[PDB]
Amino acid sequence: VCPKDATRFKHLRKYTYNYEAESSSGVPGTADSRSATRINCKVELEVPQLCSFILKTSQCTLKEVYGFNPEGKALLKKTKNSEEFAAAMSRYELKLAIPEGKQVFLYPEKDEPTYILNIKRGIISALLVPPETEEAKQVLFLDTVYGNCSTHFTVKTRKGNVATEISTERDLGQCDRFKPIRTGISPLALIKGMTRPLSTLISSSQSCQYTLDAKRKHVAEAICKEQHLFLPFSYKNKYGMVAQVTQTLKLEDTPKINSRFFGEGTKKMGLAFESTKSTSPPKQAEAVLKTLQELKKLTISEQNIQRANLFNKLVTELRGLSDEAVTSLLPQLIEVSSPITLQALVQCGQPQCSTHILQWLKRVHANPLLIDVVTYLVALIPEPSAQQLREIFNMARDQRSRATLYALSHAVNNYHKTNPTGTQELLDIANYLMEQIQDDCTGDEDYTYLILRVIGNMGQTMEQLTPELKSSILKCVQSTKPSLMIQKAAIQALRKMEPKDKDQEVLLQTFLDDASPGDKRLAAYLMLMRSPSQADINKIVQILPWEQNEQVKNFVASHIANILNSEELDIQDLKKLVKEALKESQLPTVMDFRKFSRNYQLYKSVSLPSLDPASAKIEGNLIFDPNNYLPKESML
């Protein structure tokens, strides 16, 4: 919706605007000695129709002061990235529409970078001119790169009912985004909550000066100047620190365009800012190395005057850098010095530094006990990161220890909940475990036992991603090669795999198998009773009177008798199936508990007021061959 009061242009017009701006950070007390940068671009505003605009940028030259003339004139040079800079800009064109003149919805093409988008948004906010009004006091609510705004609108010069000179001004301490954007900090610095006080010590206010065409409403020129001042470091409270943003847009020409079509990039976005990283060029890392070398040199030089300073500038650059580059570089840094790298890491509140500690630990050749200790310690930290998982996988491969694998499984579950996406890490570890087990599960009994049970820790994820591993688990369960210990571990790996129709079928096959071991048969029977079916229970009850291993028969019959004894709500449903299976069979009479396996169970149901009944279920498992004076096995 395009109100005519918002018209600041004419349709069928391309307005080519030269963008020229500079940011100059300097001290006025020393002749404004400043770090200044000069941006110059060619801009191509395109207006096939009202409020349906297309933006083509080009000829973007990025120059910055490398020196000052004696009279104070700077010396600007194009930077190394100024070419990739211009390429990045020119290689996109923007399509946008502003319903009502105060509702901005960007539609970029091919997901333009966040920072490029934000620079574009600032340019648009400079471009956006409010709808015309005859009220000089006009102040209203406006969006900007910086969020919402209470912006004042006073017409300086008006011809007829059309304003020719206008000033747009807003104090920057009132617009939505004055909240200090968080940043990584020394996680060990104890000072907190002092950020707001400083904002009081901050001064800033914006003013834009506009020259408008009364005929076609177009902006002849635009001057937007911003000045930020800081109060401390100032005698008399006026010798502080000054900053200024000065950007200008000059209308070189307004070619008329024969166009009536406007595009809308798939990605729909507003004028507001979207979070971004303190990114730095990959090169600078090498400077980090020069710096670390320098410090190592200086301790030999015996000078410590500025070492902490350089450390700070470094960790600053550090926070400018990225993750993968750091880790790739990482080994060299330790090669230089371990303890200093530690000072950096500990003072480094960035997540990657925490993740990279693991890598350090393997570098220093830590003792396995401490490796596993820290492994579990971190593994319980919420919201695991895919990277962190890759490190955990690498460490598990390297040590292949019990604690490492348990921590890996728990972190796997945590991230699985964190990210339902079956990322390539899950596939890689799944393949590695499949290698560690194969179909025969032949291997070191401790090793394969641990592999099986740790896999069970993530059973559901394995189901989701790899059915072939489940098939191999069933193979091993039905395989005679693995020891009964390994077979049982495979059975319990189904903990998180919730046996399905086929899993129940395989369990029934291996259980009703008369030659199957008594302990193995009981384990399969227990896992089958986790969620049994009436047809299954009927078959087992039919086979019960003819089962071998009298101790097995006593155990199973005692279990059934207890199930009938149980009243628990779920066991109420289970007893329906039990009854359905008891019509045409009678149980062996359950004798002996000191020399025959026996089943006992107790439930503790309490009626909590205003809450569902709480039932505590107790299972007493006794395993006795007729030759055991004491239980061969027993689980609490």
């Binding site: 770090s35 620079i119 600032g122 470091f233 019990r402």
Partner: protein, 240 residues
Amino acid sequence: VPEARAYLRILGEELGFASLHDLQLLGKLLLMGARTLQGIPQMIGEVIRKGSKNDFFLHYIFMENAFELPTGAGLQLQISSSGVIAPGAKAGVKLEVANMQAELVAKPSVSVEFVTNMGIIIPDFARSGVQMNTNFFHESGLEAHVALKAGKLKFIIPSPKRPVKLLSGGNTLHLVSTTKTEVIPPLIENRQSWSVCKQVFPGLNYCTSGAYSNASSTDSASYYPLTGDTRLELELRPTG
């Protein structure tokens, strides 16, 4: 011979397992602890025999509040400032065994510095900022050298080859570019540099000095302690 193992599950989550083989492994771990222990004394003596330098330098940020705020152009004005401590000390004694020549270093140092920084940044692209930097340093210690030779003993104390700054009150600014960190040269007008030195010894003098620009009468410039690289220092100057 019975084989047994046990494990603990919480919510069904196994919490590690214990094995008899695990007990045997722990036995070998104790044996390996003994094996590592046996050779330690000779190793630790070996470094004294050859000598080395020992450095113990913490660098801790007690105070730091960093953040950033956007800008109208869409760029990001970094803002942050910290107080930091680097309280370490240089050490490490080298012994020339059978030469009876002992070299000893012990000079703890204090680096009480502070920075504030503001920076307009272009992520992955560029930066522009200024760094407000107050400085306080100290060091003290001994450089000693003792040698026994042919029944002739001599304790040697190398003299300072540079001024010994007991105190160092320094303040500086810098203009920092993506590829560079540049100091801001001091004004020469009313550039007050002075020094007063008293004799602790004929070759060593206790020195008090101050170098600063007195621009208080000039507008836009903070008073004499500020607006420029200002140093108030307390030193022992070796005459050479």
